Amino acid sequence: VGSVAALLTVVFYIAAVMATNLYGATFPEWFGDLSKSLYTLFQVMTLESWSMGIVRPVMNVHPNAWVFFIPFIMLTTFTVLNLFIGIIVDAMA
Amino acid sequence: VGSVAALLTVVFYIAAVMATNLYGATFPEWFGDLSKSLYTLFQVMTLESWSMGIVRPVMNVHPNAWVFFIPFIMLTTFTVLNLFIGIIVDAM
Amino acid sequence: VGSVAALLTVVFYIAAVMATNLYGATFPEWFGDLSKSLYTLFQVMTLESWSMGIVRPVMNVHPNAWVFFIPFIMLTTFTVLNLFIGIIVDAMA
Amino acid sequence: VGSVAALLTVVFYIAAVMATNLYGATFPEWFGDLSKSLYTLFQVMTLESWSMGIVRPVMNVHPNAWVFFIPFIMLTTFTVLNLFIGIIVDAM
Ligand SMILES: [Br-]
Ligand SMILES: [Br-]
Ligand code: NA
Ligand code: NA
Ligand code: NA
Ligand code: NA
Ligand code: NA
Known part of the structure; x- marks a missing residue:
């Protein structure tokens, strides 16, 4: 479960870095900076x-x-x- | 699981072919070509x-x-x- | 599973009948007739x-x-x- | 299951109290009163x-x-x- 949460964060930051680069200059309100990008994604x-x-x-x-x-x-x-679903299944003990 | 993924793809392309035919001439930005249709669907x-x-x-x-x-x-x-759900159950 | 599908249909038609009555005269494009209502709901x-x-x-x-x-x-x-979920669980045999 | 439903209600009312305070004066149609806030949230x-x-x-x-x-x-x-999901599992 912890491994899944780590994978998503790393993927989210890299995607938000990528999106800032790609669409920040043409769509600044949406991808103008990493913060704007993380919120948009x-x-x-x-x-x-x-x-x-x-x-x-x-x-x-x-x-x-x-x-x-x-x-x-x-x-x-x-x-x-x-x-x-992973948290839900792990909760039962 | 693989059988399900195959069924969805075949269904998706046929639906996108059908939609292009039906609504492409009247709504071209949405169904103007198979590519536009697959994106819309x-x-x-x-x-x-x-x-x-x-x-x-x-x-x-x-x-x-x-x-x-x-x-x-x-x-x-x-x-x-x-x-x-099929992938999730098969993972265990 | 079949009992659930029957409950939803009966609920859907009664809700669409109710909505036609309530909001059909004031919002006709949305609830003007039972057909418009079933599509909206x-x-x-x-x-x-x-x-x-x-x-x-x-x-x-x-x-x-x-x-x-x-x-x-x-x-x-x-x-x-x-x-x-009911169909998914019943599928395993 | 009943404990979960109680937690959500307490969380929903506190969030709707908080939102009324924060954004009610600047966005009254959306958070103008607790009722408007509960509907928005x-x-x-x-x-x-x-x-x-x-x-x-x-x-x-x-x-x-x-x-x-x-x-x-x-x-x-x-x-x-x-x-x-809790209700669904408990039903069996
Ligand atoms: Br998806
Ligand atoms: Br809900
Ligand atoms: Na929307
Ligand atoms: Na949505
Ligand atoms: Na949605
Ligand atoms: Na939406
Ligand atoms: Na949604």
């Missing part, structure tokens, strides 16, 4: 306006932005689910 | 603006568009859940 | 624009519309989850 | 327009509003899930 992970609100406006400038977000969503919005 | 599967953003504007032109999306959502947003 | 069950898109505009005219939707969300967005 | 817990609709407009006035909502979302959108 959490919102993207929770799926709130991920497409209409974020990815569609982003993809308009970066046609292939989906190569980052779609797998990023597939990984985190699976790992979080796996982690949360 | 993933967004529809995650449920982001599926109604207000997609299905409601679509249904305005195609009154019965719900006959495609509602079952499509019912299938994928069940199979993905079944697949993800 | 599914969208509300999936949680797409349930508040900003539906309940907030509705509550503006019917201040207590939350007494219908909040429990309706609590019931269906629990029963569907319980039904889907 | 449920909508935030379901994740409907939590960022674009609520937290982003809020953070514009309170730059650190994320210190409240992100953990609030992390707690409730875990406890509800844990509670719902």
Whole structure:
């Protein structure tokens, strides 16, 4: 369980570093700095306006932005689910 | 588990082929080509603006568009859940 | 499992009948007829624009519309989850 | 199971008291009174327009509003899930 939580944090920071680099200059309110990026990627992970609100406006400038977000969503919005189930199963003793 | 992942892919491509045909000419930014369609159907599967953003504007032109999306959502947003649980159970 | 699916259908139709009556005259594009209502309540069950898109505009005219939707969300967005888990557990033999 | 449901209610009312205090004067339609706050925090817990609709407009006035909502979302959108699974397991 602790190994899963460590994997997600390392993945979250690297993704937020990557996103700052890629879309910070063109979408500064969303990826302008690591802090803005970590907040956006959490919102993207929770799926709130991920497409209409974020990815569609982003993809308009970066046609292939989906190569980052779609797998990023597939990984985190699976790992979080796996982690949360992991705590629940471990709780029974 | 591998059988489930294969079923979802085949279903996803056929649905995206179908949607391109049905709503590509009237909603090209959303279903204009297979690529645009696969991206939209993933967004529809995650449920982001599926109604207000997609299905409601679509249904305005195609009154019965719900006959495609509602079952499509019912299938994928069940199979993905079944697949993800399938990996978790198999891991132990 | 079959008993759960029957309970949800009966609940869905009665809720959609109730909603047509309550908010059909003031919000016809959303609850104007049983068909429009069943489509809206599914969208509300999936949680797409349930508040900003539906309940907030509705509550503006019917201040207590939350007494219908909040429990309706609590019931269906629990029963569907319980039904889907029910099929998964029953599949193993 | 009953202990979990009690923990969530106590957490929900305290969070809604806190939010009324913090953002009621600047965002009254959203946190103007405990009732408005409890309705908003449920909508935030379901994740409907939590960022674009609520937290982003809020953070514009309170730059650190994320210190409240992100953990609030992390707690409730875990406890509800844990509670719902708890009823399902106890049913057998
Ligand atoms: Br997914
Ligand atoms: Br809920
Ligand atoms: Na949304
Ligand atoms: Na969702
Ligand atoms: Na959502
Ligand atoms: Na959601
Ligand atoms: Na949404």
